[PDB]
Design a protein around this ligand. Structure first.
Ligand SMILES: CC(=O)N[C@@H]1[C@@H](O)[C@H](O[C@@H]2O[C@H](CO)[C@@H](O[C@@H]3O[C@H](CO[C@H]4O[C@H](CO)[C@@H](O)[C@H](O)[C@@H]4O)[C@@H](O)[C@H](O[C@H]4O[C@H](CO)[C@@H](O)[C@H](O)[C@@H]4O)[C@@H]3O)[C@H](O)[C@H]2NC(C)=O)[C@@H](CO)O[C@H]1O
Lengths: 254, 137
């Protein structure tokens, strides 16, 4: 097997899952370890995987990390667009008539600007809040990445009213320590909108940069209620909520 | 509409030229040049090569055909990738290499060293080599 050319040995390593290639293939021998830790392995992994185009044009201080960040990069919020009803959301408050799903654009509502989005969650005449608590390590983001590199964590959500009724939208996104202690908090002022509005969907987004070290969880919560005390679902509607950890770090330890 | 390739040990294989062209290093050989000779390929691997090239004469995962075709013994698999490199059939090289990587999956630093039989190069720096990245995998 080590009968093979150095270039060909590299090409085999390309097709090996990275977590395997590092904790198993590297302690096999020096001949292998030297090649696995070669930057051109990871560059070409990114190349083949599509993370990097040959017009790449933007430096990285580390291609192993950069490769993982790109591979892991994905929305950590499950069921963000109400396609599985209410699965994997925790319902912190369920007031009035319950949290409910509804196809777009719904009564006295407008269409969602992304043609991909079909359904939305909607809230009632008393406080309805739902949430998820993203365990960062379980999703593949290992510790020294979170503390020593701190890749920009980006959070988004979308919300619209009905036209015939006023309501209030609330959202909290927090980065919590291993102890579930809050270390960064996106807590925008709650938004109340009145009755006979344009029912327009609105994106809210905030990027966590240079947050403290020790983030182990991203906690994401939103919901609302109407401001007329109406039976049914005249509270705010939300859909398309995302949390994504990008490849940009604030700290390049080398 | 064919050409004759001749293996390292003399056997002549006649092939259409469109299939044979997939080997870059003999499309180039053909620009220069009665059977073209390939003394780095013995007759056996020469056939498995043209067997695969005819199967992709006109064209993520691995195809099932390419999987049944590659259910060969391990030394044939290695000759096959060396032939793919020699002949510059960039497709055959990736299928065969990807296959070797799938043998690598699931095995320990020792269990890899067994099923391929390389000798342990380190001393106790394996500790320095597992934990270096095993710290987070
Ligand atoms: C918690 C609780 O039980 N609270 C109750 C209240 O619900 C109740 O107040 C009434 O609440 C209902 C909804 O719960 C309201 O009905 C909606 O009204 C709007 C429009 O309202 C006016 O405007 C129209 C002119 O454009 C007129 O046609 C209409 O009659 C009204 O004058 C409608 O847009 C809604 O209907 C839309 O949605 C429904 C589904 O939601 C669809 O079927 C329809 O196609 C339509 O698109 C609602 O019907 C109603 O206005 C409230 N009534 C008042 C008087 O305020 C209240 C009464 O006491 O009691 C609370 O405690």
């Amino acid at each position: 097997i080590n009968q093979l050319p150095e270039n060909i040995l590299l090409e085999v390593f390309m097709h090996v899952p990275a977590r395997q290639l590092l904790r198993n293939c590297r302690p096999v021998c020096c001949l292998w370890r030297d090649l696995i830790d070669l930057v051109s392995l990871w560059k070409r992994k990114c190349l083949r995987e599509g993370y990097v185009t040959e017009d790449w044009d933007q430096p990285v201080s580390d291609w192993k990390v950069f490769y993982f960040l790109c591979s892991l990069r994905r929305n950590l919020l499950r069921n963000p667009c109400a396609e599985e009803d209410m699965k994997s959301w925790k319902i912190d408050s369920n007031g009035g008539d319950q949290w409910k799903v509804e196809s777009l654009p719904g009564a006295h509502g407008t269409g969602f600007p992304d043609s991909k989005v079909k359904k939305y969650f909607v809230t009632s005449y008393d406080m309805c809040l739902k949430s998820q608590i993203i365990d960062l390590k379980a999703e593949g983001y290992w510790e020294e990445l979170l503390d020593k590199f701190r890749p920009d964590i980006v959070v988004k959500d979308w919300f619209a009213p009905r036209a015939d009724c006023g309501c209030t939208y609330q959202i909290r996104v927090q980065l919590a320590s291993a102890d579930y202690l809050v270390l960064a908090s996106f807590e925008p002022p709650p938004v109340t909108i009145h009755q006979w509005n344009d029912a327009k969907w609105t994106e809210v987004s905030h990027t966590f940069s240079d947050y403290p070290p020790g983030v182990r969880h991203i906690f994401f919560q939103h919901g609302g209620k109407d401001t007329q005390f109406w039976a049914g679902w005249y509270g705010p509607r939300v859909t398309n909520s995302s949390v994504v950890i990008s490849h940009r770090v604030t700290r390049n330890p080398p | 509409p064919s050409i004759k390739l001749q293996s390292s040990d003399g056997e002549i294989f006649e092939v259409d030229v469109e299939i044979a062209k997939q080997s870059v290093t003999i499309k180039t050989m053909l620009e220069d040049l009665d059977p073209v000779p390939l003394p780095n390929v013995n007759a056996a691997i020469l056939k498995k090569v043209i067997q695969w090239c005819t199967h992709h004469k006109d064209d993520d995962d691995i195809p099932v055909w390419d999987q049944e075709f590659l259910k060969v013994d391990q030394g044939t698999l290695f000759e096959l990738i060396l032939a793919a490199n020699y002949l510059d059939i960039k497709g055959l090289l990736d299928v065969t290499c990807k296959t070797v990587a799938n043998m690598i999956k699931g095995k320990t630093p020792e269990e890899i060293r067994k099923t391929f039989n390389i000798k342990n190069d380190f001393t106790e720096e394996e500790e320095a080599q597992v934990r270096k990245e095993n710290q987070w995998c």
